[PDB]
Write an enzyme that holds these catalytic residues in place. Structure first.
Site, PDB file in Angstrom:
ATOM      1  N   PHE A  86      41.001  -8.901 -60.521  1.00  0.00           N
ATOM      2  CA  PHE A  86      41.758  -7.892 -61.277  1.00  0.00           C
ATOM      3  C   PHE A  86      41.117  -7.430 -62.600  1.00  0.00           C
ATOM      4  CE2 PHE A  86      45.427  -7.209 -58.592  1.00  0.00           C
ATOM      5  CZ  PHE A  86      45.401  -8.326 -57.760  1.00  0.00           C
TER       6      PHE A  86
ATOM      7  N   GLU B  57      54.890 -12.639 -62.550  1.00  0.00           N
ATOM      8  CA  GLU B  57      54.387 -13.924 -62.053  1.00  0.00           C
ATOM      9  C   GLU B  57      53.498 -14.643 -63.050  1.00  0.00           C
ATOM     10  OE1 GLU B  57      55.630 -13.824 -57.517  1.00  0.00           O
ATOM     11  OE2 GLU B  57      54.324 -15.358 -58.397  1.00  0.00           O
TER      12      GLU B  57
ATOM     13  N   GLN C 176      58.754 -17.566 -56.572  1.00  0.00           N
ATOM     14  CA  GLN C 176      59.717 -18.473 -55.980  1.00  0.00           C
ATOM     15  C   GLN C 176      59.532 -19.903 -56.519  1.00  0.00           C
ATOM     16  OE1 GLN C 176      58.579 -17.735 -51.405  1.00  0.00           O
ATOM     17  NE2 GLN C 176      57.957 -16.012 -52.817  1.00  0.00           N
TER      18      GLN C 176
ATOM     19  N   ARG D 121      58.782 -23.122 -56.517  1.00  0.00           N
ATOM     20  CA  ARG D 121      57.959 -24.322 -56.309  1.00  0.00           C
ATOM     21  C   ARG D 121      57.917 -25.122 -57.613  1.00  0.00           C
ATOM     22  NH1 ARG D 121      53.919 -22.247 -57.494  1.00  0.00           N
ATOM     23  NH2 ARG D 121      52.283 -23.712 -56.807  1.00  0.00           N
TER      24      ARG D 121
ATOM     25  N   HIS E 193      61.052 -13.682 -58.125  1.00  0.00           N
ATOM     26  CA  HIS E 193      60.539 -12.929 -56.989  1.00  0.00           C
ATOM     27  C   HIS E 193      60.556 -13.760 -55.716  1.00  0.00           C
ATOM     28  CE1 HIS E 193      57.862 -10.302 -59.833  1.00  0.00           C
ATOM     29  NE2 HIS E 193      59.122 -10.327 -60.209  1.00  0.00           N
TER      30      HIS E 193
ATOM     31  N   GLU F 199      61.745  -8.581 -57.716  1.00  0.00           N
ATOM     32  CA  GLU F 199      60.757  -8.001 -56.819  1.00  0.00           C
ATOM     33  C   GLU F 199      60.837  -8.817 -55.548  1.00  0.00           C
ATOM     34  OE1 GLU F 199      56.614  -7.736 -58.270  1.00  0.00           O
ATOM     35  OE2 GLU F 199      55.991  -8.183 -56.205  1.00  0.00           O
TER      36      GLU F 199
ATOM     37  N   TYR G 250      54.129 -10.677 -48.284  1.00  0.00           N
ATOM     38  CA  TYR G 250      53.155 -10.265 -49.326  1.00  0.00           C
ATOM     39  C   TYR G 250      51.808  -9.886 -48.660  1.00  0.00           C
ATOM     40  CZ  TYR G 250      51.601 -15.110 -49.254  1.00  0.00           C
ATOM     41  OH  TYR G 250      51.197 -16.354 -48.856  1.00  0.00           O
TER      42      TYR G 250
HETATM   43  C1  LIG Z   1      53.158  -1.482 -53.403  1.00  0.00           C
HETATM   44  C2  LIG Z   1      51.867  -2.109 -53.827  1.00  0.00           C
HETATM   45  O1  LIG Z   1      51.001  -1.447 -54.442  1.00  0.00           O
HETATM   46  N1  LIG Z   1      51.682  -3.386 -53.496  1.00  0.00           N
HETATM   47  C3  LIG Z   1      50.433  -4.073 -53.701  1.00  0.00           C
HETATM   48  C4  LIG Z   1      50.592  -5.262 -54.596  1.00  0.00           C
HETATM   49  O2  LIG Z   1      51.652  -6.078 -54.055  1.00  0.00           O
HETATM   50  C5  LIG Z   1      51.843  -7.326 -54.743  1.00  0.00           C
HETATM   51  C6  LIG Z   1      52.704  -7.299 -55.995  1.00  0.00           C
HETATM   52  O3  LIG Z   1      52.127  -6.448 -57.011  1.00  0.00           O
HETATM   53  C7  LIG Z   1      52.838  -8.739 -56.536  1.00  0.00           C
HETATM   54  O4  LIG Z   1      53.770  -8.872 -57.587  1.00  0.00           O
HETATM   55  C8  LIG Z   1      53.195  -9.725 -55.457  1.00  0.00           C
HETATM   56  O5  LIG Z   1      52.843 -11.029 -55.900  1.00  0.00           O
HETATM   57  C9  LIG Z   1      53.142 -12.144 -55.149  1.00  0.00           C
HETATM   58  C10 LIG Z   1      52.653 -13.350 -55.627  1.00  0.00           C
HETATM   59  C11 LIG Z   1      52.914 -14.508 -54.942  1.00  0.00           C
HETATM   60  C12 LIG Z   1      53.660 -14.469 -53.753  1.00  0.00           C
HETATM   61  N2  LIG Z   1      53.939 -15.644 -53.050  1.00  0.00           N
HETATM   62  O6  LIG Z   1      54.961 -15.690 -52.092  1.00  0.00           O
HETATM   63  O7  LIG Z   1      53.209 -16.734 -53.407  1.00  0.00           O
HETATM   64  C13 LIG Z   1      54.108 -13.267 -53.256  1.00  0.00           C
HETATM   65  C14 LIG Z   1      53.837 -12.097 -53.954  1.00  0.00           C
HETATM   66  O8  LIG Z   1      52.410  -9.561 -54.277  1.00  0.00           O
HETATM   67  C15 LIG Z   1      52.526  -8.249 -53.749  1.00  0.00           C
HETATM   68  C16 LIG Z   1      51.912  -8.287 -52.402  1.00  0.00           C
HETATM   69  O9  LIG Z   1      52.368  -7.474 -51.563  1.00  0.00           O
HETATM   70  O10 LIG Z   1      50.981  -9.119 -52.122  1.00  0.00           O
HETATM   71  O11 LIG Z   1      49.381  -6.015 -54.659  1.00  0.00           O
HETATM   72  C17 LIG Z   1      48.904  -6.488 -53.403  1.00  0.00           C
HETATM   73  C18 LIG Z   1      47.679  -7.379 -53.633  1.00  0.00           C
HETATM   74  O12 LIG Z   1      46.701  -6.582 -54.317  1.00  0.00           O
HETATM   75  C19 LIG Z   1      48.612  -5.304 -52.515  1.00  0.00           C
HETATM   76  O13 LIG Z   1      48.170  -5.786 -51.254  1.00  0.00           O
HETATM   77  C20 LIG Z   1      47.034  -5.113 -50.737  1.00  0.00           C
HETATM   78  O14 LIG Z   1      47.491  -4.037 -49.907  1.00  0.00           O
HETATM   79  C21 LIG Z   1      46.395  -3.283 -49.395  1.00  0.00           C
HETATM   80  C22 LIG Z   1      46.969  -2.137 -48.637  1.00  0.00           C
HETATM   81  O15 LIG Z   1      46.678  -1.005 -49.066  1.00  0.00           O
HETATM   82  O16 LIG Z   1      47.720  -2.346 -47.645  1.00  0.00           O
HETATM   83  C23 LIG Z   1      45.464  -4.147 -48.528  1.00  0.00           C
HETATM   84  O17 LIG Z   1      44.275  -3.402 -48.270  1.00  0.00           O
HETATM   85  C24 LIG Z   1      43.442  -3.784 -47.158  1.00  0.00           C
HETATM   86  O18 LIG Z   1      44.074  -3.375 -45.933  1.00  0.00           O
HETATM   87  C25 LIG Z   1      44.240  -1.950 -45.789  1.00  0.00           C
HETATM   88  C26 LIG Z   1      44.806  -1.657 -44.402  1.00  0.00           C
HETATM   89  O19 LIG Z   1      45.794  -0.634 -44.516  1.00  0.00           O
HETATM   90  C27 LIG Z   1      42.920  -1.191 -46.002  1.00  0.00           C
HETATM   91  O20 LIG Z   1      43.158   0.222 -46.000  1.00  0.00           O
HETATM   92  C28 LIG Z   1      42.251  -1.599 -47.308  1.00  0.00           C
HETATM   93  O21 LIG Z   1      41.018  -0.898 -47.437  1.00  0.00           O
HETATM   94  C29 LIG Z   1      42.056  -3.120 -47.272  1.00  0.00           C
HETATM   95  N3  LIG Z   1      41.197  -3.660 -48.338  1.00  0.00           N
HETATM   96  C30 LIG Z   1      41.313  -3.470 -49.676  1.00  0.00           C
HETATM   97  C31 LIG Z   1      40.260  -4.111 -50.540  1.00  0.00           C
HETATM   98  O22 LIG Z   1      42.190  -2.823 -50.228  1.00  0.00           O
HETATM   99  C32 LIG Z   1      45.082  -5.428 -49.240  1.00  0.00           C
HETATM  100  O23 LIG Z   1      44.634  -6.387 -48.309  1.00  0.00           O
HETATM  101  C33 LIG Z   1      46.259  -6.097 -49.894  1.00  0.00           C
HETATM  102  O24 LIG Z   1      45.707  -7.140 -50.670  1.00  0.00           O
HETATM  103  C34 LIG Z   1      49.880  -4.457 -52.345  1.00  0.00           C
HETATM  104  O25 LIG Z   1      49.621  -3.256 -51.620  1.00  0.00           O
HETATM  105  C1  LIG Z   2      41.860  -7.016 -70.379  1.00  0.00           C
HETATM  106  O1  LIG Z   2      42.090  -6.700 -71.760  1.00  0.00           O
HETATM  107  C2  LIG Z   2      42.078  -7.753 -72.737  1.00  0.00           C
HETATM  108  C3  LIG Z   2      42.225  -7.122 -74.133  1.00  0.00           C
HETATM  109  O2  LIG Z   2      41.954  -5.706 -74.118  1.00  0.00           O
HETATM  110  C4  LIG Z   2      40.807  -8.608 -72.606  1.00  0.00           C
HETATM  111  O3  LIG Z   2      40.848  -9.728 -73.501  1.00  0.00           O
HETATM  112  C5  LIG Z   2      40.621  -9.095 -71.164  1.00  0.00           C
HETATM  113  O4  LIG Z   2      39.400  -9.844 -71.056  1.00  0.00           O
HETATM  114  C6  LIG Z   2      40.618  -7.909 -70.187  1.00  0.00           C
HETATM  115  N1  LIG Z   2      40.567  -8.386 -68.810  1.00  0.00           N
HETATM  116  C7  LIG Z   2      39.727  -7.937 -67.865  1.00  0.00           C
HETATM  117  C8  LIG Z   2      39.893  -8.584 -66.520  1.00  0.00           C
HETATM  118  O5  LIG Z   2      38.881  -7.072 -68.045  1.00  0.00           O
HETATM  119 CL   LIG Z   3      56.742 -15.453 -55.042  1.00  0.00          CL
END
Ligand SMILES: CC(=O)N[C@H]1[C@@H](O[C@H]2[C@H](O)[C@@H](O)[C@H](Oc3ccc([N+](=O)[O-])cc3)O[C@@H]2C(=O)O)O[C@H](CO)[C@@H](O[C@@H]2O[C@H](C(=O)O)[C@@H](O[C@H]3O[C@H](CO)[C@@H](O)[C@H](O)[C@H]3NC(C)=O)[C@H](O)[C@H]2O)[C@@H]1O
Ligand SMILES: *[C@@H]1O[C@H](CO)[C@@H](O)[C@H](O)[C@H]1NC(C)=O
Ligand SMILES: [Cl-]
Ligand SMILES: *[C@@H]1O[C@H](CO)[C@@H](O)[C@H](O)[C@H]1NC(C)=O
Ligand SMILES: *[C@@H]1O[C@H](CO)[C@@H](O)[C@H](O)[C@H]1NC(C)=O
Ligand SMILES: *[C@@H]1O[C@H](CO)[C@@H](O)[C@H](O)[C@H]1NC(C)=O
Ligand SMILES: [Cl-]
Ligand SMILES: [Cl-]
Ligand SMILES: [Cl-]
Lengths: 74, 385
Positions: free
Chosen positions: B2, B67, B112, B114, B138, B185, B190
């Site tokens: 990230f 989270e 959740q 844990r 969440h 959320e 996920y």
């Molecule tokens: C709506 C949205 O933008 N959702 C994102 C985002 O969802 C996550 C939330 O922001 C989090 O708060 C939540 O966090 C947690 C943490 C822990 C748990 N737990 O039970 O321990 C649960 C949840 O998690 C949310 C989640 O849904 O995971 O962020 C995630 C992670 O970055 C996004 O997930 C990505 O979605 C991509 C997608 O566009 O579908 C997916 O991409 C891959 O697959 C698609 C196939 O359609 C390809 O087109 C892409 O090219 C491919 N590769 C890449 C590099 O993007 C990707 O795998 C997945 O990580 C979610 O969309």
């Molecule tokens: C995001 O921003 C903060 C302050 O601007 C910085 O300390 C941190 O290293 C940055 N994180 C990434 C992943 O670039």
């Molecule tokens: Cl979770």
């Protein structure tokens, strides 16, 4: 047989949920999409969002903690 | 993985106008990873945003961090719950000095419960609990990458949610008794959702059951991931077309009231026939004070027939039964209400949600792998007036 009897508790409310009990999110990630303005300006999308009023719209997700406000940006 | 990104005033405006034009109340999560040398939250960026939002007259509620339990993994920074609570205190001071001095503040948006998360939540609530208006956490059932069709239909998977809820309330009751608890959320799976599952009729068992349990167990608000966006747990697809969970959500909104009651099945297996009971939503023009809304999920592979108890056995009941539009069965992205495909009239117009009046005295039919709402008319339940 496949007939089942229900029992109901109706003496008083057991809990009270918000009128906005069923709410929705927009992931913080969406603000990184170049088309964010087109997307959320969509009249079709807003009609659908209105259907779920009253509700909260929570803007957040993993990208919450990787987003910085820049008041110079256009 | 990230990296930091920026967003503009334009973006803030897009988001607010979307919420405001849609009659929704915006909650905005602030970046909690902006830190001073000694790991205190650096509020300077949030101060910039608060000021800007104040300047436009935007009525917004706030969160801080998402989270935080996994900050060490995400950014190699560990913020303990005590520190996070202090951070929330500092945000609350900024809000109290702003134009919206009564703006609401929710957190900490932990995952959740844990062990380590529960510990962080407890210390957070001890430290910062006085300043939050609701506790947010969440929940997702499964990893989208591996989830199966069977998982989406499995009562053993559905039931895991119950112990998560109990654990969160255990923490809250030991620290801030009575503080409202919100699912901040939540979704099926996920990783963006389970391909070909989280966007289908099959997704509705998890969504409706979660709503039912959440309401039954004392959760006051449930925030669905996601209205629109990446992945496939969205309610609305890339073409701005509603998926089955949207229509289920709309029906729930229209029929299900704020006052939560209880239903259960005699004989009491209580696994594959899942039932929930609220007073009917009084905003619905069709119904009246006293009316009941039952909703039910049938995860059996045969139709079940439900009999209402006295004194409701002979009441007029309105059925609202959802089944998939073929040919893809539970994996369909289209749904029928009482045999009528649900679809927009046009871009500005939702369709009417047409009930099916049943013969008074009849048993309530619930087909295999289906869910339905039933409004019991003239129920005259004192609790619901
Ligand atoms: C709506 C949205 O933008 N959702 C994102 C985002 O969802 C996550 C939330 O922001 C989090 O708060 C939540 O966090 C947690 C943490 C822990 C748990 N737990 O039970 O321990 C649960 C949840 O998690 C949310 C989640 O849904 O995971 O962020 C995630 C992670 O970055 C996004 O997930 C990505 O979605 C991509 C997608 O566009 O579908 C997916 O991409 C891959 O697959 C698609 C196939 O359609 C390809 O087109 C892409 O090219 C491919 N590769 C890449 C590099 O993007 C990707 O795998 C997945 O990580 C979610 O969309
Ligand atoms: C995001 O921003 C903060 C302050 O601007 C910085 O300390 C941190 O290293 C940055 N994180 C990434 C992943 O670039
Ligand atoms: Cl979770
Ligand atoms: C907070 O962050 C900004 C960087 O945008 C920096 O200029 C400021 O000095 C920081 N404050 C503290 C106390 O570290
Ligand atoms: C929590 O974190 C702060 C900041 O790193 C630290 O000073 C404090 O001692 C920690 N508290 C506990 C209970 O570990
Ligand atoms: C229901 O499932 C069982 C096995 O788990 C099977 O033997 C039975 O024939 C199924 N019934 C229907 C209607 O598919
Ligand atoms: Cl509009
Ligand atoms: Cl901790
Ligand atoms: Cl069975």
């Amino acid at each position: 047989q496949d007939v089942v009897d229900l029992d109901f508790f109706t003496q008083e409310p057991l809990h009270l949920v918000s009128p906005s009990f069923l709410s929705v999110t927009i992931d913080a990630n969406l603000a990184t999409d170049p088309r964010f303005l087109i997307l959320l300006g969509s009249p079709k999308l807003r009609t659908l969002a209105r259907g779920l009023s009253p509700a909260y719209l929570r803007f957040g997700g993993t990208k919450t903690d990787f987003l910085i406000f820049d008041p110079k940006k256009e | 993985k990230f990296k930091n990104s920026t967003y503009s005033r334009s973006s803030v405006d897009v988001l607010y106008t979307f919420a405001n034009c849609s009659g929704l109340d915006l909650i905005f999560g602030l970046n909690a990873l902006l830190r001073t040398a000694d790991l205190q939250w650096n509020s300077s960026n949030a101060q910039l945003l608060l000021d800007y939002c104040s300047s436009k007259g935007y009525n917004i509620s706030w969160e801080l961090g998402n989270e935080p339990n996994s900050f060490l993994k995400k950014a190699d920074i560990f913020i303990n719950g005590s520190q996070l609570g202090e951070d929330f205190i500092q945000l609350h001071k900024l809000l109290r000095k702003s134009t919206f001095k009564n703006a609401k503040l929710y957190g900490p948006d932990v995952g959740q419960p844990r062990r380590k998360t529960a510990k962080m939540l407890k210390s957070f609530l001890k430290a910062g609990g006085e300043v939050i208006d609701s506790v947010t956490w969440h929940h997702y059932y499964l990893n989208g990458r591996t989830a199966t069709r069977e998982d989406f239909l499995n009562p053993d998977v559905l039931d895991i949610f119950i112990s998560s809820v109990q654990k969160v309330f255990q923490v809250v009751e030991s620290t801030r008794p009575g503080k409202k608890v919100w699912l901040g959320e939540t979704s099926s799976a996920y990783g963006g959702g389970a391909p070909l599952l989280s966007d289908t009729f099959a997704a509705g068992f998890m969504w409706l059951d979660k709503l039912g349990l959440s309401a039954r167990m004392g959760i006051e608000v449930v925030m669905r991931q996601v209205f629109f966006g990446a992945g496939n747990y969205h309610l609305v697809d890339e073409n701005f077309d509603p998926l089955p969970d949207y229509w289920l959500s709309l029906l729930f909104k229209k029929l299900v009231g704020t006052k939560v009651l209880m239903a259960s099945v005699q004989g009491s297996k209580r696994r594959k026939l899942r039932v929930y009971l609220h007073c009917t939503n009084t905003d619905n023009p069709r119904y009246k004070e006293g009316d009941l809304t039952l909703y039910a999920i049938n995860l059996h592979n045969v139709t079940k027939y439900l009999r209402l108890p006295y004194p409701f056995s002979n009441k007029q009941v309105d059925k609202y039964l959802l089944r998939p539009l073929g040919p893809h069965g539970l994996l369909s992205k289209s749904v029928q209400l009482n045999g009528l495909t649900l679809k927009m009239v046009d871009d500005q117009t939702l369709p009417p949600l047409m009930e099916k009046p049943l013969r008074p005295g009849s048993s309530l039919g619930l087909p295999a792998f289906s869910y339905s709402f039933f409004v019991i008319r003239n129920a005259k339940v004192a609790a619901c007036i």
